[PDB]
């Protein structure tokens with residue numbers, strides 16, 4: 340069964356638009372989005388559709404690129420490090436729930452290296 344998806348807007352949370360956050364959306368996210376391995380991560384895990392009834396029994400802080408994309412489109416974040424922590428959560432979630440060598444983990448590991456490649460150098464203020 341599926342918990343509610345993570346929030347993509349929060350009116351009591353202060354918004355911010357930084358050069359780095361614009362970067363994370365326009366180059367980092369949108370390039371990762373197109374990767375041949377991105378598709379499992381473009382939406383919250385649907386534990387019913389994917390027959391992963393134990394996913395949200397194991398994963399207590401779900402995160403996906405679809406959630407990150409909408410948070411970025413809504414200036415949900417205060418700074419880029421907040422966004423980068425969401426990406427890191429998505430990857431570590433995948434490593435927690437699965438085990439080394441699974442196809443999904445091979446996909447996450449590849450995306451993580453592309454992600455770490457692209458955030459090595461961010462714009463400045």
Ligand SMILES: COc1ccccc1S(=O)(=O)Nc1ccc2c3c(cc(N4CCN(C)CC4)nc13)C(=O)N2C
Pocket residue numbers: 379380384389391432433436437441442443
């Ligand atoms: C088996 O399925 C897939 C395998 C590879 C790619 C895509 C699918 S998928 O699109 O069919 N399903 C999934 C989509 C998204 C996820 C998972 C994760 C683990 C996982 N499993 C690992 C194997 N195990 C026997 C079943 C559960 N499957 C999916 C997981 O961390 N994420 C975020």
